[PDB]
């Protein structure tokens, strides 16, 4: 069976567009944003997310990962795509050759 041509329309690599479209009718476009900022401020205000060393090691690893993606991402993307295209073309030039074989026989 074939495979769909795309994934799931995620935003900021963390949130799928389904959530934005799901909150838009009853909060508008800034609704998800205001909900997120309010939840953030309540989380780090009532000390349910303790700011500690882990906060800064997390900021480090997240900066590293976002830069790693935004730099070496398209390269890996088109590399996987080229792997696929090479395999496909090799198989097709492997079909043609056997057709030619049988016709020559």
């Amino acid at each position: 069976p074939p495979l769909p041509e795309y994934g799931g329309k995620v935003r900021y690599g963390l949130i799928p567009e389904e959530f934005f479209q799901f909150l838009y009718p009853k909060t508008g476009v800034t609704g998800p944003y205001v909900l997120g900022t309010g939840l953030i401020l309540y989380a780090l205000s009532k000390e349910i997310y303790v700011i500690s060393a882990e906060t800064f090691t997390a900021l480090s690893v997240l900066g590293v990962m976002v830069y790693g993606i935004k730099k070496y991402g398209p390269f890996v993307a088109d590399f996987a795509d080229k792997l696929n295209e090479q395999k496909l073309a090799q198989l097709e030039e492997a079909k043609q050759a056997s057709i030619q074989h049988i016709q020559n026989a």
């Binding site: 909060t27 476009v29 800034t30 909900l35 309010g38 401020l41 309540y42 780090l44 000390e47």
Partner: protein, 77 residues
């Protein structure tokens, strides 16, 4: 960048004096819905969505008290 303030000034304003009549009338509406028992006739979707908007405005209360204390994490004292 600039559409941030566009959205702020276009949706999230304090109610204009001409609106809190509409606000009081719609609060009359919803607590009338409470007095009748119409809330029980509400299904999953807008129930959880009203819960979400309540969470949002409660976050707004917490933001209000943090701007009260002029500090964010706990009390500066």
């Amino acid at each position: 960048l600039a559409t941030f303030w566009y959205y702020a000034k276009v949706e999230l304003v304090p109610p204009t004096p001409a609106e809190i009549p509409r606000a009081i009338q719609s609060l009359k509406k919803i607590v009338n819905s409470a007095q009748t028992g119409s809330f029980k006739q509400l299904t999953v979707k807008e129930a959880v969505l009203n819960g979400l908007v309540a969470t949002e405005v409660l976050m707004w209360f917490y933001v209000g008290e943090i701007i009260g204390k002029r500090g964010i994490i706990g009390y500066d004292v």
